[PDB]
Short mmCIF file of N, CA, C and O in Angstrom, two decimals:
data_model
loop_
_atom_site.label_atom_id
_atom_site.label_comp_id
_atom_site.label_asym_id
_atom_site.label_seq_id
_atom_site.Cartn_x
_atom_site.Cartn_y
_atom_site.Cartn_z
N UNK M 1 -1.79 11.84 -11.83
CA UNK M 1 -1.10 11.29 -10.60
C UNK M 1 -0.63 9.87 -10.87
O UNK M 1 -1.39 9.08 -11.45
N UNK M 2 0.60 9.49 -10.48
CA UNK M 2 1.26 8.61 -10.86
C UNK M 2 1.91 7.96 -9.42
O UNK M 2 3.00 8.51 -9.31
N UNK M 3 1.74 7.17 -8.45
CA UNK M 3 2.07 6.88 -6.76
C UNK M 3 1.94 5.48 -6.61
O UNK M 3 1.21 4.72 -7.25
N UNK M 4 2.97 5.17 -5.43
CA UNK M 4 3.44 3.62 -5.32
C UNK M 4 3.90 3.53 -4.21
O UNK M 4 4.70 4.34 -3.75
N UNK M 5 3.30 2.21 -3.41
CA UNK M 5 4.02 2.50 -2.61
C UNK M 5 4.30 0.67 -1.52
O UNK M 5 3.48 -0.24 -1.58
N UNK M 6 5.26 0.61 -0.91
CA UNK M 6 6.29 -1.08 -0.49
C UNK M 6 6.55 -0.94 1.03
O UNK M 6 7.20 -0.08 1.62
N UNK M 7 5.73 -2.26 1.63
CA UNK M 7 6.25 -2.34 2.84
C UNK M 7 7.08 -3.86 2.97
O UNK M 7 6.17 -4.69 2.94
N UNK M 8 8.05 -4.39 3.06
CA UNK M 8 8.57 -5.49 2.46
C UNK M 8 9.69 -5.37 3.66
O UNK M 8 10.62 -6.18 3.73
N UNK O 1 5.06 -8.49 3.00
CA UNK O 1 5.30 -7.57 1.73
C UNK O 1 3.91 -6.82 1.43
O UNK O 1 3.25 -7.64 0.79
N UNK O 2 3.29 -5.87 1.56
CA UNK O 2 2.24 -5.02 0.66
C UNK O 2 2.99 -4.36 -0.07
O UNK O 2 4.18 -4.08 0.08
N UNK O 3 2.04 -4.03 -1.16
CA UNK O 3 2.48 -3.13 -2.54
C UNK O 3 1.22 -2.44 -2.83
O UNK O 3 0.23 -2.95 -2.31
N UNK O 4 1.02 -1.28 -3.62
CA UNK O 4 0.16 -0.72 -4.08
C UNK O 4 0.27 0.29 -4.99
O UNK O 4 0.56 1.37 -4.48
N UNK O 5 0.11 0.31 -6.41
CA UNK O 5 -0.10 1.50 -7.45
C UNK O 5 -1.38 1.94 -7.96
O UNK O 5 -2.45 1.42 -8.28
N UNK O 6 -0.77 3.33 -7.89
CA UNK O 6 -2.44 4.11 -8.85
C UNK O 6 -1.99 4.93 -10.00
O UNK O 6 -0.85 5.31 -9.73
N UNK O 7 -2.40 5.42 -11.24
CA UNK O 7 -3.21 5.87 -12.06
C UNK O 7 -4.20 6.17 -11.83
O UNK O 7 -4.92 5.20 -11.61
N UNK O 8 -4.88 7.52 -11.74
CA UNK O 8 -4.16 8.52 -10.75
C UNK O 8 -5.36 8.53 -9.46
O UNK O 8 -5.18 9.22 -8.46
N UNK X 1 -4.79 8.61 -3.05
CA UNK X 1 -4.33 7.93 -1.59
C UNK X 1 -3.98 6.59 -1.76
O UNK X 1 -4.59 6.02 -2.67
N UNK X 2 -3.26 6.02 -1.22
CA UNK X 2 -2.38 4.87 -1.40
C UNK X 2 -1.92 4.58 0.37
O UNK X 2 -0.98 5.18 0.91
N UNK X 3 -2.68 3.70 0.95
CA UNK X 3 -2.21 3.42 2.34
C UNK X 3 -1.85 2.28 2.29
O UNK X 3 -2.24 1.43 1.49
N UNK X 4 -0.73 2.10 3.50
CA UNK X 4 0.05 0.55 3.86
C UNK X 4 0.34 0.20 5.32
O UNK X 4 0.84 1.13 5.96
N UNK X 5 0.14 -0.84 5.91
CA UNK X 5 0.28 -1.23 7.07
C UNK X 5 0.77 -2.42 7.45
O UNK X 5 0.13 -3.39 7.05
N UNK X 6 1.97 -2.68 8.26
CA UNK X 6 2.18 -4.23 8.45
C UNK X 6 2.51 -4.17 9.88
O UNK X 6 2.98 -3.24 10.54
N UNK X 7 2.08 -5.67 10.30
CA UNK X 7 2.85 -5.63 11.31
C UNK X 7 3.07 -7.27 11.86
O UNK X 7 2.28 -8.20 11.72
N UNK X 8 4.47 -7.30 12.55
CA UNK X 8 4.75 -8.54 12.44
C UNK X 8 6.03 -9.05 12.86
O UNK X 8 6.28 -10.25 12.74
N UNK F 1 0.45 -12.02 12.60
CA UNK F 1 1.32 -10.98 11.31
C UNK F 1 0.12 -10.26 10.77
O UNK F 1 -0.78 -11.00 10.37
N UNK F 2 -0.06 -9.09 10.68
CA UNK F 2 -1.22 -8.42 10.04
C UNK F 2 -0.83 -7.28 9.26
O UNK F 2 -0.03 -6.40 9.57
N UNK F 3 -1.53 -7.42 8.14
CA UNK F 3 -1.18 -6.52 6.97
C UNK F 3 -2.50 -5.87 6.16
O UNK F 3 -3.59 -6.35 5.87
N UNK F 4 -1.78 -4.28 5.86
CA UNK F 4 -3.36 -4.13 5.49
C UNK F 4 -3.17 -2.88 4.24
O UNK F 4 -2.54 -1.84 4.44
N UNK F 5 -3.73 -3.17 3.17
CA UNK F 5 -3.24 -2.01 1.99
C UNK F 5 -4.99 -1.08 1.62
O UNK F 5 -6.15 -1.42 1.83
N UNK F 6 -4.55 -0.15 1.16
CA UNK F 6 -5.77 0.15 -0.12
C UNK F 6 -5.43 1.78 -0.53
O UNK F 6 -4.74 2.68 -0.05
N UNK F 7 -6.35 1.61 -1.71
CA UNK F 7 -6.56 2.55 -2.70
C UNK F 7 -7.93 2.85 -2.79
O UNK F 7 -8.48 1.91 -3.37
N UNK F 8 -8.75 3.74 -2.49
CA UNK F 8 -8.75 4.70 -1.75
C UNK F 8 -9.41 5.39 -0.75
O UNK F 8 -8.94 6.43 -0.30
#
């Protein structure tokens, strides 16, 4: 598992 | 701004 | 799991 | 302003 994640 | 990555 | 929250 | 991340 490879996951990312942007609150910007 | 939050950010966050995983492996895995 | 990867959680994010903003507020603002 | 409130912000809030995590893993897991």
């Amino acid at each position: 598992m490879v996951g990312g994640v942007v609150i910007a």
